């Protein structure tokens with residue numbers, strides 16, 4: 431019933447609390463999962479707080495080294511980022527054993543180079559958590575405290591908890607999705623598109639946000655609102671976080687700010703040009719993970735391409751601009767009826783017969799792979815959009831791009847099969863891209 435703050439937080443409205451890491455609370459109202467009413471034990475004052483910033487006191491969720499339901503691959507991405515020394519570690523839930531845990535730790539050897547080792551934290555039915563049966567503990571907390579004090583047979587001491595990215599609230603404020611335009615201040619234009627602008631700005635003069643603004647006449651405000659109600663339900667690490675919307679024209683879509691812009695631009699600037707093939711395949715795997723989430727939700731992107739992937743802190747990739755292409759209205763200059771779609775990225779049955787499915791998104795993902803492996807090259811170079819439609823209808827697809835491995839191109843060709851049911855699932859593509867290089871590793875470290 432008693433909670434403790436994991437991070438600092440500054441109030442944004444007049445209803446929420448300002449608190450410091452280590453401050454404790456009573457929780458009074460949890461009707462909204464994202465924001466809880468709470469009373470501070472330090473000040474005695476009552477206000478709402480972001481629920482993901484607190485954890486039960488003394489619980490494992492309040493430990494700095496506990497990362498909850500993070501994935502193995504995400505744990506590796508986090509541990510192998512700068513600021514984590516050798517011996518940086520985290521504890522997570524097991525992906526392959528219900529009720530078990532995993533200890534992930536950064537290590538180095540001559541064969542695997544700089545890598546992460548994973549240890550299975552199992553639980554005896556009679557009692558006791560253990561990495562090795564020789565030593566047993568009442569709780570995972572005690573296990574960690576022990577392996578932080580002495581290296582009892584691991585690859586290293588548990589030296590420091592893994593560093594975490596800047597935490598973010600789920601929504602700008604309690605019970606807030608549709609906001610007035612006056613609450614947004616557009617400060618710096620980030621770019622201009624055919625459907626509108628993107629700006630960096632603030633909400634309530636306090637919270638840094640990005641705002642995509644749509645030109646009037648782009649889409650029905652009511653249709654936009656009904657689709658945003660569904661988008662609001664999508665929640666995943668590899669999708670860009672929607673904060674709020676403004677429905678009156680011009681429409682605002684307010685999201686978190688991604689400090690490196692689009693993947694397409696990032697791959698062309700010097701930092702992206704220095705990228706090696708493993709990093710490129712890992713970004714592809716991140717996009718495939720987000721799209722596999724959308725596949726589980728049977729939510730169709732319709733506009734999957736490198737310009738609609740955003741790159742943020744730690745080069746994390748997030749999927750943007752999903753769902754909304756369906757609602758884009760017609761004009762007198764484009765013969766495309768009803769739903770608009772990016773010509774060079776759209777599957778033949780979707781472009782010609784309007785059958786948008788997750789399999790047409792798979793085709794799109796193959797095109798995005800060509801974009802990504804070449805570090806920004808235009809698809810079907812030399813061909814205009816009409817020629818592309820005509821040729822992909824006849825079964826033409828792109829040849830192997832320069833510098834693309836044979837297995838990656840075989841995957842692309844699989845995504846470009848004319849029968850949509852013969853294309854792989856995003857689940858398969860995620861598994862393939864994650865294990866593309868780490869093919870011979872043993873899953874968990876054998877340790878007696």
Ligand SMILES: CN1CCN([C@H]2CC[C@H](n3cc(-c4ccc(Oc5ccccc5)cc4)c4c(N)ncnc43)CC2)CC1
Pocket residue numbers: 620621622628640641642670683684685686687688689690691692695740749750751752754
């Ligand atoms: C030459 N370049 C100049 C920059 N151009 C682009 C300009 C906008 C950039 N950009 C775009 C976005 C962005 C913002 C909101 C948005 O709305 C939706 C999100 C999910 C689903 C539906 C809608 C979609 C995208 C962006 C960002 N959030 N944070 C930081 N940067 C951002 C990405 C690059 C691309 C061409």
Ligand SMILES: [Cl-]
Pocket residue numbers: 597598599
């Ligand atoms: Cl935030």
